[PDB]
Each structure stands twice: as structure tokens, then as C-alpha cells.
Design a protein around this motif. Structure first.
Motif, PDB file in Angstrom:
ATOM      1  N   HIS A  34     -11.699   2.638   8.103  1.00  0.00           N
ATOM      2  CA  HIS A  34     -11.280   2.749   6.713  1.00  0.00           C
ATOM      3  C   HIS A  34     -11.392   1.434   5.947  1.00  0.00           C
ATOM      4  CE1 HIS A  34      -8.374   2.658   9.934  1.00  0.00           C
ATOM      5  NE2 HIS A  34      -7.801   1.675   9.260  1.00  0.00           N
ATOM      6  N   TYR A  35     -11.192   0.291   6.607  1.00  0.00           N
ATOM      7  CA  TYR A  35     -11.181  -0.973   5.873  1.00  0.00           C
ATOM      8  C   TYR A  35     -12.534  -1.247   5.219  1.00  0.00           C
ATOM      9  CZ  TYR A  35      -6.851  -1.870   8.446  1.00  0.00           C
ATOM     10  OH  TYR A  35      -5.598  -1.817   9.027  1.00  0.00           O
ATOM     11  N   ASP A  36     -13.621  -1.046   5.960  1.00  0.00           N
ATOM     12  CA  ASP A  36     -14.954  -1.377   5.471  1.00  0.00           C
ATOM     13  C   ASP A  36     -15.652  -0.214   4.759  1.00  0.00           C
ATOM     14  OD1 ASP A  36     -15.081  -0.053   7.867  1.00  0.00           O
ATOM     15  OD2 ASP A  36     -16.495  -1.420   8.855  1.00  0.00           O
ATOM     16  N   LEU A  63     -13.987   0.831   1.883  1.00  0.00           N
ATOM     17  CA  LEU A  63     -13.676   0.234   0.592  1.00  0.00           C
ATOM     18  C   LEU A  63     -14.514  -1.012   0.375  1.00  0.00           C
ATOM     19  CD1 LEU A  63     -11.164   2.097   1.205  1.00  0.00           C
ATOM     20  CD2 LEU A  63      -9.864   0.467  -0.131  1.00  0.00           C
ATOM     21  N   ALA A 101     -14.879  -3.330  -2.882  1.00  0.00           N
ATOM     22  CA  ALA A 101     -14.279  -4.424  -3.630  1.00  0.00           C
ATOM     23  C   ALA A 101     -13.727  -3.850  -4.929  1.00  0.00           C
ATOM     24  CB  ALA A 101     -15.314  -5.522  -3.901  1.00  0.00           C
ATOM     25  N   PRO A 102     -12.556  -4.283  -5.396  1.00  0.00           N
ATOM     26  CA  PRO A 102     -11.994  -3.663  -6.597  1.00  0.00           C
ATOM     27  C   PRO A 102     -12.883  -3.879  -7.810  1.00  0.00           C
ATOM     28  CG  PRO A 102     -10.795  -5.641  -6.084  1.00  0.00           C
ATOM     29  CD  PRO A 102     -11.746  -5.421  -4.949  1.00  0.00           C
ATOM     30  N   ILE A 112     -13.507  -5.032 -11.336  1.00  0.00           N
ATOM     31  CA  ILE A 112     -12.875  -5.973 -12.243  1.00  0.00           C
ATOM     32  C   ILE A 112     -13.468  -5.685 -13.614  1.00  0.00           C
ATOM     33  CG2 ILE A 112     -12.114  -7.718 -10.591  1.00  0.00           C
ATOM     34  CD1 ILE A 112     -15.211  -8.605 -12.662  1.00  0.00           C
ATOM     35  N   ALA A 121      -4.736   2.593   4.017  1.00  0.00           N
ATOM     36  CA  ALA A 121      -4.757   1.151   3.812  1.00  0.00           C
ATOM     37  C   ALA A 121      -3.543   0.660   3.040  1.00  0.00           C
ATOM     38  CB  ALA A 121      -6.032   0.747   3.077  1.00  0.00           C
ATOM     39  N   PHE A 122      -3.147   1.374   1.989  1.00  0.00           N
ATOM     40  CA  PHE A 122      -2.109   0.887   1.094  1.00  0.00           C
ATOM     41  C   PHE A 122      -0.820   1.698   1.187  1.00  0.00           C
ATOM     42  CE2 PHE A 122      -5.728  -0.634  -1.932  1.00  0.00           C
ATOM     43  CZ  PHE A 122      -6.150  -1.515  -0.959  1.00  0.00           C
ATOM     44  N   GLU A 169      -0.756  -3.437  -3.726  1.00  0.00           N
ATOM     45  CA  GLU A 169      -0.273  -4.716  -3.214  1.00  0.00           C
ATOM     46  C   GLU A 169       0.390  -5.558  -4.304  1.00  0.00           C
ATOM     47  OE1 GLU A 169      -0.197  -5.729  -0.010  1.00  0.00           O
ATOM     48  OE2 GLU A 169      -1.151  -3.887   0.710  1.00  0.00           O
TER      49      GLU A 169
END
Ligand SMILES: [Mg+2]
Ligand SMILES: [Mg+2]
Ligand SMILES: [Mg+2]
Ligand SMILES: [Mg+2]
Ligand SMILES: [Mg+2]
Ligand SMILES: [Mg+2]
Ligand SMILES: [Mg+2]
Ligand SMILES: [Mg+2]
Ligand SMILES: [Mg+2]
Ligand SMILES: [Mg+2]
Ligand SMILES: [Mg+2]
Ligand SMILES: [Mg+2]
Ligand SMILES: [Mg+2]
Ligand SMILES: [Mg+2]
Ligand SMILES: [Mg+2]
Ligand SMILES: [Mg+2]
Ligand SMILES: [Mg+2]
Ligand SMILES: [Mg+2]
Ligand SMILES: [Mg+2]
Ligand SMILES: [Mg+2]
Ligand SMILES: [Mg+2]
Ligand SMILES: [Mg+2]
Ligand SMILES: [Mg+2]
Ligand SMILES: [Mg+2]
Ligand SMILES: [Mg+2]
Ligand SMILES: [Mg+2]
Ligand SMILES: [Mg+2]
Ligand SMILES: [Mg+2]
Ligand SMILES: [Mg+2]
Ligand SMILES: [Mg+2]
Ligand SMILES: [Mg+2]
Ligand SMILES: [Mg+2]
Ligand SMILES: [Mg+2]
Ligand SMILES: [Mg+2]
Ligand SMILES: [Mg+2]
Ligand SMILES: [Mg+2]
Ligand SMILES: [Mg+2]
Ligand SMILES: [Mg+2]
Ligand SMILES: [Mg+2]
Ligand SMILES: [Mg+2]
Ligand SMILES: [Mg+2]
Ligand SMILES: [Mg+2]
Ligand SMILES: [Mg+2]
Ligand SMILES: [Mg+2]
Ligand SMILES: [Mg+2]
Ligand SMILES: [Mg+2]
Ligand SMILES: [Mg+2]
Ligand SMILES: [Mg+2]
Ligand SMILES: [Mg+2]
Ligand SMILES: [Mg+2]
Ligand SMILES: [Mg+2]
Ligand SMILES: [Mg+2]
Ligand SMILES: [Mg+2]
Ligand SMILES: [Mg+2]
Ligand SMILES: [Mg+2]
Ligand SMILES: [Mg+2]
Ligand SMILES: [Mg+2]
Ligand SMILES: [Mg+2]
Ligand SMILES: [Mg+2]
Ligand SMILES: [Mg+2]
Ligand SMILES: [Mg+2]
Ligand code: NA
Lengths: 54, 92
Positions: free
Chosen positions: B2-4, B6, B8-9, B11, B44-45, B88
Motif C-alpha cells: 500500500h505504501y508505494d 500512493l 505524492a500529494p 500540491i 496508511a492513515f 497527518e
RNA sequence: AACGAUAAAAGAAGUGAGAAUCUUCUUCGCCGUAAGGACAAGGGUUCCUGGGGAAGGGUCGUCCGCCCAGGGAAAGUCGGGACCUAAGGUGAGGCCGAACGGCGCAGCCGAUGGACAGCAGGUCAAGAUUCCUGCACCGAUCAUGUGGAGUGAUGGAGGGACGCAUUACGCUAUCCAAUGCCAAGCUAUGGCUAUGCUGGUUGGUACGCUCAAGGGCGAUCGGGUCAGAAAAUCUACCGGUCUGCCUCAGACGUAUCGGGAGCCGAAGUUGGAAACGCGACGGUGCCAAGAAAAGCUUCUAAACGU
RNA sequence: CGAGCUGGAGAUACGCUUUGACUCGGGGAUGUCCGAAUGGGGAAACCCACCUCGUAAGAGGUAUCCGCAAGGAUGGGAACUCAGGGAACUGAAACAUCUCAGUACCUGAAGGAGAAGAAAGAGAAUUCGAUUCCGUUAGUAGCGGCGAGCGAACCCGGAUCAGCCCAAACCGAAACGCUUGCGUUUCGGGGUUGUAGGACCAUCAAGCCGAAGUGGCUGGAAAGCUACACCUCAGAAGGUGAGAGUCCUGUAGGCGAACGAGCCCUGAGUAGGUCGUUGUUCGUGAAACGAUGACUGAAUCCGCGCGGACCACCGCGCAAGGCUAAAUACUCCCAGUGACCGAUAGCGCAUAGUACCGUGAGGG
């Protein structure tokens, strides 16, 4: 447990990637170091496959 | 895992005003689907997801050096959480 | 020579090193079944923002569909796929052929067709049956309860299932009038003092012992084996058997969510017109005789229970 | 290997490295999706599934044809090999036979080569002795609208040379076949031919070590000039501010690793024949011989094929079963070399199958 050892480097690489997308990526090398530690950590698994089971 | 998934947010001034609505916007690996993208966000969150939308986005065709360039290719996904709207807190 | 239609342009103001050409204001002229708007093919960031000014622009250029960077693109319900079939393409077995190859049943692919659940608004600089608000609908899994038993197939039947011209009735979209309503102010030029002028004058949903054209439908008991592979309580054939039911297009009322000219929110009337759209698969005439399949409805076969 | 490294990349930040990085030689392990593509579909790189693993995330399988099974095949290769097909411009100063040419092209199969190969041969000496390649024979012998033109072989000299196994006469089966110790195909022993035989009876790798010069002069700069030296199994070469034997890399020579690559029988729907054709010098010619498309169809060792119609004699050879290295060809790839180019040359490209043109094949 080795999956536990791997995903910690994964999550740090993810949050570090987010930081790179924002305004702070002051130590780029910590990136590829972590990627190294993933590759090594998987390569070692391969050595326990054929070993023992033959 | 799951981490990879996602990427990058996002912007974007539009994406950051949506940050104030409990809406969160970030890029993902284009070949992923909604079901796994949602369980990835919430593994993740730690937060319930009640609304997903997704959209393939072509790479812009920039050119450097007078060698014609190529695309890049992404898949931004927008997500709305339950009333437990935290991430976060890392919003700015 | 030309500078790509004889649809004109003028002034003021601004920005800038620089302006007939860029921005603004006020006029003028041109399209208006278009030279306005919404899509499909096709194109591929041309979109918005901020910058630029080499070249591209038939002149200029502070501008641009050009150049640089950053953003923008959201769907259970719209279009396609996870459903179906047409021509056509394929095609195990099969039929042919100096080789490569050529045909070909079932089956499969194949939308230009069939089937299928959402409407109203708001609004980024840039997205909207997608995001947001209001309020629905559709399938699937589970749980509580009623029910407390029959489900009922790669097979059968019905059905989907279709031409052209013309045309009766009713209606909405939508358009017009007005001394209907509502809002705002003014008026001079000679007059009008408003009965003038200008503008707006309802969308969705829920509930009605409300008004309503139109449209659909016959219906069971039984006989026959020779029909639908067999089955069948479903179909088909044949024999007995007695106007009425359903549907709302749309209108009206009540409520509610919206929108609404305008300086937060007014009014929502009466009269007229009217579709190729809707009621609908209506009626009539005609010959050149107007796809298939799934979904859908109905039956047992097997199996599973009762 | 012994201080650098962080690709071209030339642009910083960040680091990594004398517990050996980087680079080189050699192995492993990862290896998305498409593509023979192969789970099903498909407009390549995208859609849709099923089955066991099953805690999930992830993994493994699911094409067809060969075969009991292992295990094999499918696709891809610049040219080279063999095969199934097979042109025409052209020459003949026109054109039919003829040539061009079994050339181009298409297709199939295979490999590092391939094909061919072990005499029912060549041939005229009772010589020879598998195949292939080269020289010569020799443009001779021949073929030919006897036109254009086409064109062998033997002997001899070279390159390389290797020969080998099955069928069958007879043993012993087993299984099945029928009136009774037999004969259809399997398995062993045995047995493989023409001077007839056989059966049954007496080093290359990555790399390491490697000799010998200093002063003055011109000059921006020394390697040039000069004056005295030195090595030489090393004066091949490249770099270095201009021309260096003695400055660097090297050279002659020497060493050199765990894993690393590399020499009674002897073959029948046949031999033979008639019809159509064809190959070698073979164009119907007196036209043999091999070759199959159609129809026929023998003989055994006192026998069978050939020796260019045919006959006799005299000679050569044993068909209808298989395998077989090397001498030969080629050049995608690597090394060396050049009375080869040096920017309109040389490959199309000092790199590009790019830009550009085309619906495409394709051109560029
Ligand atoms: Mg949503
Ligand atoms: Mg003109
Ligand atoms: Mg002006
Ligand atoms: Mg000024
Ligand atoms: Mg100027
Ligand atoms: Mg003008
Ligand atoms: Mg303008
Ligand atoms: Mg002004
Ligand atoms: Mg238009
Ligand atoms: Mg398009
Ligand atoms: Mg697009
Ligand atoms: Mg623009
Ligand atoms: Mg603008
Ligand atoms: Mg702009
Ligand atoms: Mg300019
Ligand atoms: Mg410029
Ligand atoms: Mg210009
Ligand atoms: Mg979508
Ligand atoms: Mg919705
Ligand atoms: Mg659809
Ligand atoms: Mg189909
Ligand atoms: Mg067909
Ligand atoms: Mg076909
Ligand atoms: Mg369609
Ligand atoms: Mg629908
Ligand atoms: Mg706005
Ligand atoms: Mg727009
Ligand atoms: Mg809307
Ligand atoms: Mg009417
Ligand atoms: Mg009036
Ligand atoms: Mg009025
Ligand atoms: Mg029933
Ligand atoms: Mg009303
Ligand atoms: Mg079907
Ligand atoms: Mg080194
Ligand atoms: Mg460099
Ligand atoms: Mg496939
Ligand atoms: Mg496949
Ligand atoms: Mg497979
Ligand atoms: Mg000719
Ligand atoms: Mg001629
Ligand atoms: Mg001829
Ligand atoms: Mg050739
Ligand atoms: Mg070929
Ligand atoms: Mg091949
Ligand atoms: Mg010889
Ligand atoms: Mg030199
Ligand atoms: Mg000297
Ligand atoms: Mg023999
Ligand atoms: Mg014969
Ligand atoms: Mg003959
Ligand atoms: Mg003749
Ligand atoms: Mg003879
Ligand atoms: Mg013959
Ligand atoms: Mg003779
Ligand atoms: Mg030269
Ligand atoms: Mg050139
Ligand atoms: Mg030039
Ligand atoms: Mg070229
Ligand atoms: Mg083109
Ligand atoms: Mg093109
Ligand atoms: Na007045």
C-alpha cells in the motif's frame, strides 16, 4: 518478520517522497540508501529459498 | 504494498482549499484501481473512506534542448473521508 | 505583383523603451436556420493562471491557437466494457489444395442496432446528470421480522419483433397580447404625469374520495396424441363456457426544496397560438411485404430440500 | 585494481569510499506489459476470467502438436547450404525452337556450416578405387533455327582423407495361428558382401612486473638547436603548450587467480517395359542411362545391372536399407592490416533509418 522489516523502509520512502513533492528534501541520498536496504533485504530471502530446501 | 501505491500529494491551490473540506487529493500509480486505492489510503492513515473519484491524466509533452519530448503520465485521485477528517495534519 | 472576399469604422482613456493594430469606455456597421448554441469523428494541451517577445503572425505587436513554467480533467445511474446479436471477420473437429495457403457447422468476435437504475439547482481563474446541497432510483451481501415452504435450468413456449404515405382527438415544450400581478425610477425635447416607459411574470419532488383526451385487455374448464426431444401445471389445435377492468400523458390544488427582476428577495393572472416531442405499440389506406439475439414472462428435466 | 567515485551531462545540492569504493573479468538473484505469446478476447503493449495457495497483500497454473512417459517442437537470424515452385526484359541486329537462366523472385527445412558420400560407379589400362574443393585437361570431345550461342568427363597434379552399421538365410523364445514337433511381427545371440560374402555340416583469459638524460639557446610554451652522457631481447605506436628511444601510457621479455572458455540366403508392386517428359555436352537425333506422372510387371549366383540403337564375345559392378567427421561457402560480430576515403569523399548517417514525405508497402 522480513515483510515487517521491508515495509518500514517502504513507508519512510513514501513519506520522504511526499516531502520531496513539498518544500523539504534536504538529504536525497537517504532515498537510494533505503532502496538499497529493500533490495538487499529481498536478495537475502532468495538465499534462504534454495538453501535448505535444495 | 500500500505504501508505494500512493505517489505524492497533489500540491495545488485548488487541492489545498479542498484540504479544508476534509477532501484529500493525491497522485497514484495509474494502473491501480479504486478499491485498492481506498484500502491503501485507509491502511496508511487509519481513516474511513466514504468517497472516491479517480482520473487518468496524460503526461504533458514538454521539449528540452530542441529534442522533442514525451509525456510523463499520472492518475490523480480525490478522496473524501468520514467525519473523522484528520490526516497527518500535514496540510500547507 | 501581391499582403487571401467591398461585413465599414471613429474618438477618448490606459499600458509600454516603443502603439492605426494590445486593454478599457462610449458609439457606429455585419451575421442571426448564423457568421449563435450542443454533440460525433478527427486533433492532442491548443484549456485557465503568471510570465516572454527570437522566430511563427502575410505589416506592427506591449498581443496570439506562438515560447517557458505551474495548475485544470472527478460518475453505481451519461457513452463504451464486465450483457446480446447483423453484414463481415474468425473458427477445435470437418472439406480441399506443389508449398505459403483456400473453404467451413456449431461456437466466438463484431454497433452503425437491442437491453439498462437520477432529477433539480449551486459553483474553481480553468470540471460537472461526475464535485457540493436537497431529495430519489438500481443491482448485490448480511442482519432483524413477516413468511414459516418450493425453488424452478446451456432445454420448451410466449415476448422482445420492427415497412411506407396519410391522419382523428388531447397535451407540454414554447411563443404572443393585455389598463392582470410585481419591481424600479424618470420624466423635459412641442405633448404625455400614467390607462406612459422598462423589466420580471415559475422549475423538481411528495401527497390528492380533484378534472382529464388517449391507449392496453377478452377469460377460464376440458379433449386429443400424431406438434413444440422427453417432460410440462406454460404454449399451439380443437371443441364447453360470462359495455366492464387498468393506465396515466398532461392540467389543478396543498406542501416543500429551488430559482427569480432587483435593492437578502417581489410577483407569480386572464386570454390566444403550437410541434417531427409526449399520450401510444392509436386510426385508415397501400404494395414494393418491411433483422437477430440476450434481457424479460411463463414450464418442467436434473439436483436440493420439504 | 589500489584512490577515487556519484553514466553521456558538461548544472548544483547529496553522499559513498584504504574493514577495497568506482572500473575490469566471472558467476548468481531480481526480472512490469506486448511480442512464437500460449488461460479466453483483442484495434501489440490493453480488456475479461477460472482453479487449486488460501489470513490478506502477493505467488503458482490453465494454447496447440509429438508422444504411456520423461523429454521434444511452434518463433527469430546479414549472407552461405539444400529443397518445392519458377519469370521477363534481353541476344538472336525482326521472332516462335534457342538464349537470358533453373538467373531474379516466392516458399519450406537446417546448421555453424551445409550438401554429398563408401561403387549394380568411372572407364578401355583385364587400369581405378567413398564424397567435396582447387589446378589442368580445354574451349578439347560434343550440343546447336549446326544460327545466336552453349559446353563436359577420364588420365594427371594438389587440399583432405575413415571408414560403418542394419535387413535376410539359422539359433532360442512368446503370443496367436489352424490337425496333432509349423510361421505373420517383436526380443536377444548370430550375420553383414563381388579377388562374392554369410549361414548349416565336418593455449586463450581481467591484469600485474618492465632499462636508459641533464645543462645552456630560440620560443607563449621544448620534444626542436646545441653540448656532453645513457639503455637497447625494448628506436612499434599514442599523449604530452612544436618534432621526445631515456617525461607518461606503452614496447621486447617475464609472471599471472577461486569460478572462466577451448577436438536354404543377400532388400521387389522393384528391376524391366509402353505412353508423357526431363537431367548431364544430350534441342527426338541412330539416343543409350538415370528420373518419376499414368498402366503393366521379373529373376537368383550355371543369377542380376551397365559398357551410348541393337546382337555375340570380352570386360566392370551387386540395385531396390541407414549413418557418417575433414578439405568447401558466407560474413550480422571481433582483431589486425591498407601505393583506401578524409566532410559534395567515405556507410544513407563523423551517426539517423532520425527530421521530413507517404493511407500504406515504402522512400529519406
Ligand atoms: Mg463519488
Ligand atoms: Mg487576391
Ligand atoms: Mg481603436
Ligand atoms: Mg507613460
Ligand atoms: Mg522595436
Ligand atoms: Mg482593421
Ligand atoms: Mg484584438
Ligand atoms: Mg474610462
Ligand atoms: Mg455553430
Ligand atoms: Mg477524441
Ligand atoms: Mg481528450
Ligand atoms: Mg487562451
Ligand atoms: Mg488572460
Ligand atoms: Mg497567456
Ligand atoms: Mg516579435
Ligand atoms: Mg528566445
Ligand atoms: Mg511579424
Ligand atoms: Mg471514470
Ligand atoms: Mg450522486
Ligand atoms: Mg451502457
Ligand atoms: Mg456474441
Ligand atoms: Mg459466418
Ligand atoms: Mg476463413
Ligand atoms: Mg451504438
Ligand atoms: Mg440508462
Ligand atoms: Mg466564478
Ligand atoms: Mg469550459
Ligand atoms: Mg448540473
Ligand atoms: Mg395535434
Ligand atoms: Mg399598452
Ligand atoms: Mg409591460
Ligand atoms: Mg409454478
Ligand atoms: Mg398556480
Ligand atoms: Mg448466445
Ligand atoms: Mg581503478
Ligand atoms: Mg563530465
Ligand atoms: Mg494472451
Ligand atoms: Mg499465447
Ligand atoms: Mg503457458
Ligand atoms: Mg520479347
Ligand atoms: Mg532480339
Ligand atoms: Mg521465346
Ligand atoms: Mg542473390
Ligand atoms: Mg529463402
Ligand atoms: Mg527457420
Ligand atoms: Mg586427385
Ligand atoms: Mg611521440
Ligand atoms: Mg635530447
Ligand atoms: Mg542388396
Ligand atoms: Mg521404369
Ligand atoms: Mg522415354
Ligand atoms: Mg532441331
Ligand atoms: Mg544396354
Ligand atoms: Mg533408365
Ligand atoms: Mg558398347
Ligand atoms: Mg588522401
Ligand atoms: Mg556524407
Ligand atoms: Mg558541405
Ligand atoms: Mg539513405
Ligand atoms: Mg503522413
Ligand atoms: Mg507517418
Ligand atoms: Na419633463
Amino acid at each position: 518478520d522480513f515483510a515487517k522489516e521491508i515495509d518500514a523502509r517502504k513507508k519512510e520512502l513514501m513519506e520522504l517522497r511526499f516531502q520531496a513533492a513539498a518544500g523539504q528534501l534536504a538529504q536525497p541520498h537517504r532515498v537510494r540508501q533505503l532502496r538499497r536496504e529493500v533490495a538487499q533485504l529481498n536478495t537475502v530471502k532468495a538465499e534462504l529459498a534454495r538453501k535448505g530446501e535444495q | 504494498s500500500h505504501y508505494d501505491i500512493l505517489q505524492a500529494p497533489v500540491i495545488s491551490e485548488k487541492a489545498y482549499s479542498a484540504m479544508e473540506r476534509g477532501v484529500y487529493s493525491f497522485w497514484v500509480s495509474p494502473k491501480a484501481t479504486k478499491t485498492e486505492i481506498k484500502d491503501a489510503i485507509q491502511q496508511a492513515f487509519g481513516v474511513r473512506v466514504i468517497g472516491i473519484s479517480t482520473m487518468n491524466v496524460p503526461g504533458k509533452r514538454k521539449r528540452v534542448g530542441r529534442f522533442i519530448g514525451q509525456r510523463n503520465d499520472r492518475k490523480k485521485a480525490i478522496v473524501r473521508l468520514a467525519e473523522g477528517q484528520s490526516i497527518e495534519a500535514l496540510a500547507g
